[PDB]
Amino acid sequence: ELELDEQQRKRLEAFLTQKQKVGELKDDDFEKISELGAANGGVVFKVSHKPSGLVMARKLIHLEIKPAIRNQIIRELQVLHECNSPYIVGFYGAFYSDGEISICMEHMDGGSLDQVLKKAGRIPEQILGKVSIAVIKGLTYLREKHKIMHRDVKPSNILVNSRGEIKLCDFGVSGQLIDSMAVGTRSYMSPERLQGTHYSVQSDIWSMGLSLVEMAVGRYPIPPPDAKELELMFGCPMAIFELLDYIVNEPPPKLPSGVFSLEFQDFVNKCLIKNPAERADLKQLMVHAFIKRSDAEEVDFAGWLCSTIGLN
Ligand SMILES: C[C@@]1(O)CCN2C(=O)CCc3cccc1c32
Numbered sequence: 001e002l003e004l005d006e007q008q009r010k011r012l013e014a015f016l017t018q019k020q021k022v023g024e025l026k027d028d029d030f031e032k033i034s035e036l037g038a039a040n041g042g043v044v045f046k047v048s049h050k051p052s053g054l055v056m057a058r059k060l061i062h063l064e065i066k067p068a069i070r071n072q073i074i075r076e077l078q079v080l081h082e083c084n085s086p087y088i089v090g091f092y093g094a095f096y097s098d099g100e101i102s103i104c105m106e107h108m109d110g111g112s113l114d115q116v117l118k119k120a121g122r123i124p125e126q127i128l129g130k131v132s133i134a135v136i137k138g139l140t141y142l143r144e145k146h147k148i149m150h151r152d153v154k155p156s157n158i159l160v161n162s163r164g165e166i167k168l169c170d171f172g173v174s175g176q177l178i179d180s181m182a183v184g185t186r187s188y189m190s191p192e193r194l195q196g197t198h199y200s201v202q203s204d205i206w207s208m209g210l211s212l213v214e215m216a217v218g219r220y221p222i223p224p225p226d227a228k229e230l231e232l233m234f235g236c237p238m239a240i241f242e243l244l245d246y247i248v249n250e251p252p253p254k255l256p257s258g259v260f261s262l263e264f265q266d267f268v269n270k271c272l273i274k275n276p277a278e279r280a281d282l283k284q285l286m287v288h289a290f291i292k293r294s295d296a297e298e299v300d301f302a303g304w305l306c307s308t309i310g311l312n
Helices: 006-021 067-081 113-120 125-146 175-180 202-217 227-233 240-249 262-271 282-286 289-296 301-309
Strands: 030-039 042-049 055-062 091-097 100-105 158-160 166-168
Touching (some): 030 055, 042 100, 067 091, 067 100, 067 175, 113 158, 113 202, 113 301, 125 166, 125 282, 125 289, 125 301, 202 262
Antiparallel strands (some): 042 055
């Protein structure tokens, strides 16, 4: 499950070889190309690293803090140089300059799945099959190689590219950065995390299940759509506090019947069991009928993606 094919190994090696050529990251070495979107705590820009010529994604977090705090943040982010996986967004480095922390990472030309979803309307089950494999693999990697859980799985934290790669980003590695920042959505948080109770990688599986239902139906799935709302979709307002209460108190969302395969439906159901002990784990998810089927499917994710978003 963590072993790599020839292509994956080669791309991972090529990234590291290019990264080695970049030295210390400095503010004045960046030329702004465009705005990629906004992440929690700051804006993400597509940039040119002038000396190396490398195109990067630069996230800028505005923080007015003492040299003590920022130097500790930068050191804590250094842990990202150790995360090397086809399912994790490549990291270049982090620095502080004139009231803002910069996190420089690999450019993903397909952007986030939250952006792809807006464009597509809804994402096909076979495409969600590849997405599920990449998320399980990224979460397994983080857990097994670094003893870390994501803590913030959502469609805006799943990045995609024209080579067909799917990678996770914005997993909390710096405690100090979270404290100083600290304000992202709690709408993908598991019922146990919202109840302050017992929380592990099982809470990330809930967030993945919820993100998958959202992408499949083309709508944040809580509260569930009524009989008339589903007819407009396939043919076949709640304030944040009300929503969080609904998650904790009500049955979990589910895919509509007779539109998706029973394997996909069962897969999301197992991710969405409210009790984390009963909820499927990464090991069980890796061998789920939906995962085994999707893994054997020869799905052109890059082709689908480029056609959908008008990339090219
Ligand atoms: C979370 C992130 O900042 C990662 C970088 N990124 C990209 O490379 C593509 C566009 C994008 C949109 C929203 C958030 C991000 C990105």
